[PDB]
């Protein structure tokens, strides 16, 4: 009418992941047993981008933003893994530690199996609280922990009386 | 594995206007459907959709605390150890599992120590995440996990993919 | 070109009935065993409105028109059932009587079963002829009998010599 | 249950013009395919289609004796009891079945009565209806059921849905 | 409402006409029922109602599921016909 267009993204949802048949079978319809599969084809009707790993594909590192992102609701820390898929990735938050474990099978042979691991590890009690810091991976393995650097705020941090103790709990503030 | 898509939440933000499809067309360009612009419902293409208002329209109650996005349900799971103070509670969140450890001593003795403890836990890879769920408590030793809830049961398996950027990681039911 | 549009109906064929997967499996393709299902998805291509109960859904009562509709080819009588689906409904025309029977299971418990019935019943020999009055339900259970109030025209009515006896057969006319 | 759609009769009335899809577009608006107008063949949307000529074009030989509609095949089934006058014949039509009862006395006697009788019938829930089929006879006691034929084998089962309004209740083969 | 009680079953028939017409009669009806040979009896349960058409069966309850099968044995004489659970 007035005339406008974007198009360069249109390649994406044909092959967002590897385009397995079991892929669009998870995201087409509804979980009943008569529901068929509509699983991938140059007949499907859309190709659609709405599943998790597919929006995080153009994000890729997911901005990769590692700091500043400070004091607010949305302190953020970027746990890099340089190249791994989500499943070889494995995040854990535990009191004063945030860690990512990555473990891939690089190459397989004879009776030999060649594992690579990435273990990016922290200890940051003043900065991380498992009650409110929250951990998000990108499809390349990069994990960002985000959120308020403050609910509990003690050493372990775990002095978590936050609902009713407020003076001492916040005497360690957004620091 | 799990057949699962937020088809109601996908359809909702295209319909609140004088056309159920102009809210794709106007957010992918404007009226240039030989040049690609898609009729939406069952011929859809990328969620390019970058004009920010669409990603905010379905739930401004998710705040817009980052970008793209298209938003999410909200829920809570309760780790209600019905005993002690919060000082006795430790918490850990881990991919598919959420767990707490209540760790008290009821009493000391001339002879030693009287421990009383709790190991409360859920394995819920559709519902709790080390991510889109944050947490809270009450002074009875009751630990709560809460917020814009997990909605992903992907065929890959390690799916905490939302850096406060809720879709495409809204792609499941509550299962 | 000259520019015109209707759109408010577009919601209908996604959920015209409950959208079971066995639904569009009946109305997509052709009855061969290699024929697949295309049973329902946000990846079908249409959503299409062409099956029986779906056009009768916006009709709803099917106008509900109970008379006048008189003397012509298209006398009509509306056998109401206030709320029931087609299968709990059960029409019968038999000489001088037209009747609808409805029978639903309202609620089920323990070893108890709570049936509701509707039995709208007539006897109208001058008006109804099973040879030419014809009985149509709407999706809400409302049944209209329509057609000429005249072929046979006798008491039972059944004096049906209409092909060759014409004077006495029509001495009871469109009355 | 029964996979069944009038796909030839659906396609027929779109094609008799200088475009096989303008006969959807011009009957759903005109040239406003972003605002929603659909390309027809295999991306279709509602049979809104309310501009009356489309519902008449495929078979003005169904008369237009009510509205919407899009029309139907025509056929007859014969309940030819080859005996008596039509006075001896009774008829009943009932959902999935059509039946007649020939009820004669050949002769009276000093001792009583000599009955001779017939019970002719079909169970044909795709072909005869208490509805879109009307009826007629010949003076040999021959009862005929006839007209715009049944074309519905729906998964629900009680399908006499056409108040002289033939689609969507044309949605089957002759089966 | 009509009511009938019968050994192993209890049933009611709601039998209304909503409306009359120039052409005839508009019936609306209900057939509510339980098959409960441990819990309702043509006997130790009496009955009552409310004006909404609600029919209640009530009282010192059935407690017999005997191997014979036709067990309404208590002439207001409750044992030995108390010999069962609520099943």
DSSP states of D47-76: ----STHHHHTT-GGGTTSSSS-----EEE
Q: Give the residue from chain A lying closest to C19, CA to CA.
A: A30
Kindly report the nearest CA distance between residue C120 and chain B, in angstroms: 40
Kindly report the nearest CA distance between residue A43 and chain C, in angstroms: 9
Strand partners, A89: A102
Q: Give the residue from chain A lying closest to B131, CA to CA.
A: A134
Task: Using alpha carbons, select from D6, D3, D151, A32 the residue that is nearest to residue C33.
Answer: D3
Kindly report the nearest CA distance between residue B5 and chain A, in angstroms: 5
Strands ordered across the beta sheet of E2-6 = D112-123, D97-109, D89-94, C89-94, C97-109, C112-122, E24-35, E9-21, E2-6
CB contact (8 A) between residue B19 and residue D36:
yes
A14's tokens: 């044909």
Strand partners, C107: C114
Which residues of A, range 112-131, sit inside 8 Å of B by Cβ?
130-131
CA dist., res. C70 & res. C147, Å (int):
10
Is the CB of residue B143 less than 8 Å from the CB of residue B100?
yes
Cβ atoms within 10 Å, residue A166 = 10
- Quick one: fold of E1-62? Immunoglobulin-like (2.60.40)
Grouping H, G, I as helix, E, B as strand and the rest as coil, residue B146 is strand
Strands ordered across the beta sheet of B112-123 = A112-121, A97-109, A89-94, B89-94, B97-109, B112-123
- Alpha-carbon C103 to chain mean position: 16
Task: Using alpha carbons, select from C50, B12, B31 the residue that is nearest to residue D37.
Answer: B31
Tell me which chain B residues have a C-beta less than 8 angstroms from the C-beta of A142: none
Task: Using alpha carbons, select from C129, C142, C119, C3 the residue that is nearest to residue C59.
Answer: C142
Provide the annotated binding site of C for Zn(2+).
83, 104, 106, 111, 119
Name the neighbours of E, counting chains with at least 3 Cβ pairs within 8 A.
Answer: C
CA dist., res. A39 & res. C43, Å (int):
10
E33 CB contacts (<8 Å, ≥6 apart)?
C112, C113, C114, C115, E9, E10, E11, E12
User: Considering CB atoms only, which of D10, D30, D161 is closest to C1?
Assistant: D30
CA dist., res. B130 & res. A100, Å (int):
12
Task: Using alpha carbons, select from B92, B137, B146, B166 the residue that is nearest to residue A99.
Answer: B92
Q: What is the DSSP letter of D82?
A: -
Q: What is the DSSP letter of A117?
A: E
Which secondary-structure segment (H or E) carries B115? strand B112-123
CB contact (8 A) between residue C115 and residue E26:
no
User: Considering CB atoms only, which of E18, E24, E32 is closest to C121?
Assistant: E24
Largest pairwise CA distance in chain B: 87
CB contact (8 A) between residue B19 and residue D38:
no
Which secondary-structure segment (H or E) carries B55? helix B53-56
What distances in angstroms separate CA B92 from CA B82, B174, D55, one per listed residue? 18, 22, 65
**β-bridge pairing A73-79 and A143-148:** antiparallel
A93's tokens: 């938050």
CB contact (8 A) between residue A3 and residue B162:
no
D70 CB contacts (<8 Å, ≥6 apart)?
D9, D10, D13, D47, D49, D54, D55, D58, D166, D167, D168, D170
Place of tokens 């069962």: E84
D170's tokens: 């044309």
CA dist., res. C114 & res. E34, Å (int):
9
CA dist., res. E57 & res. E37, Å (int):
14
Grouping H, G, I as helix, E, B as strand and the rest as coil, residue D162 is coil
What distances in angstroms separate CA B133 from CA A157, B48, E86, one per listed residue? 19, 26, 46
Cβ atoms within 10 Å, residue E6 = 11
Largest pairwise CA distance in chain E: 59
Is the CB of residue A93 less than 8 Å from the CB of residue A133?
yes
CA dist., res. B131 & res. A146, Å (int):
9
CB contact (8 A) between residue A34 and residue C20:
yes
Grouping H, G, I as helix, E, B as strand and the rest as coil, residue A114 is strand
CB contact (8 A) between residue B21 and residue D38:
no
CA dist., res. C5 & res. C52, Å (int):
25
How many interface pairs between B and C have CB atoms less than 8 angstroms apart? 27
**Binding site annotation covers A31?**
no
Q: Give the residue from chain C lying closest to A31, CA to CA.
A: C21
Residue B60 burial by CB count (10 A; 0-12/13-18/19+): exposed, middle or buried?
exposed
CB contact (8 A) between residue B41 and residue C7:
no
- Alpha-carbon A16 to chain mean position: 17
Question: Among the residues of chain D, which ranges form H helices?
Answer: 7-11, 22-25, 53-56
Place of tokens 């009806």: E29
CA dist., res. A114 & res. E78, Å (int):
80
Q: What are phi and psi of B78, to 5 degrees?
A: -110, 125
Is the CB of residue C5 less than 8 Å from the CB of residue D36?
yes
CA dist., res. C42 & res. D77, Å (int):
42
Cβ atoms within 10 Å, residue C2 = 8
CA dist., res. D162 & res. D131, Å (int):
7
The CA-to-CA distance between both ends of chain E, in Å, stands at 28
CB contact (8 A) between residue A38 and residue C36:
no
Q: What is the DSSP letter of A8?
A: G
Q: What is the DSSP letter of D8?
A: H
Q: Give the residue from chain E lying closest to C83, CA to CA.
A: E28
CA dist., res. A132 & res. A96, Å (int):
12
Q: Give the residue from chain C lying closest to B17, CA to CA.
A: C8
CB contact (8 A) between residue E36 and residue C112:
yes
CA dist., res. D134 & res. B114, Å (int):
90
Q: What is the DSSP letter of A133?
A: -
Is the CB of residue B22 less than 8 Å from the CB of residue D34?
yes
Q: What is the DSSP letter of A11?
A: G
A103's tokens: 């473990």
Strands ordered across the beta sheet of C134-137 = C73-79, C143-148, C134-137
D38 contact B CB<8A = yes
- Quick one: fold of A69-150? Immunoglobulin-like (2.60.40)
**DSSP string across chain C:** ---EE--GGGGGGGSSS---HHHHTTTSS-SSTT-------TTSS-----SHHHHHHHHTTTT---S---SSEEEEEEE--SS--TTTEEEEEETTEEEEEEEEEEEEETTEEEEEEEEEEE--TTT--TTT-EEEE-TTS-EEEEEES-SS-SSSS----TTT--HHHHHS---
CB contact (8 A) between residue C25 and residue A38:
no
Which residues of A, range 131-150, sit inside 8 Å of B by Cβ?
131-132, 134-139, 144, 146-147
CA dist., res. A101 & res. A120, Å (int):
7
Residue A130 burial by CB count (10 A; 0-12/13-18/19+): exposed, middle or buried?
buried
Kindly report the nearest CA distance between residue B159 and chain C, in angstroms: 23
CA dist., res. B163 & res. A144, Å (int):
7
Polymer length of chain D? 175
CA dist., res. C119 & res. C90, Å (int):
10
B83's tokens: 């005993």
E63's tokens: 């407690």
Q: What are phi and psi of D53, to 5 degrees?
A: -60, -35
Grouping H, G, I as helix, E, B as strand and the rest as coil, residue B10 is helix
CA dist., res. E76 & res. E72, Å (int):
11
CA dist., res. D117 & res. D104, Å (int):
6
Kindly report the nearest CA distance between residue C156 and chain D, in angstroms: 9
Provide the annotated binding site of D.
83, 104, 106, 111, 119
């Amino acid at each position: 009418m007035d005339i406008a267009i974007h198009h360069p993204w249109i390649r994406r949802p044909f092959f967002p992941f590897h385009s397995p048949s079991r892929l669009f079978d998870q995201f087409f319809g509804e979980h009943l047993l008569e529901s068929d599969l509509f699983p991938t084809s140059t007949s499907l009707s859309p190709f659609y981008l709405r599943p998790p790993s597919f929006l995080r594909a153009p994000s890729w590192f997911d901005t990769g933003l590692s700091e500043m992102r400070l004091e607010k609701d949305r302190f953020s820390v970027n746990l890099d893994v340089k190249h791994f898929s989500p499943e070889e990735l494995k995040v854990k938050v535990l009191g004063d530690v945030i860690e990512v474990h990555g473990k891939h099978e690089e190459r397989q042979d004879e009776h030999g199996f060649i594992s690579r691991e990435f273990h990016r590890k922290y200890r940051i009690p003043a900065d991380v609280d498992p009650l409110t810091i929250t951990s998000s991976l990108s499809s390349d393995g990069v994990l960002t922990v985000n959120g308020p650097r403050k609910q509990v705020s003690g050493p372990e941090r775990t002095i978590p009386i936050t609902r009713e103790e407020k003076p001492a709990v916040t005497a360690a503030p957004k620091k």
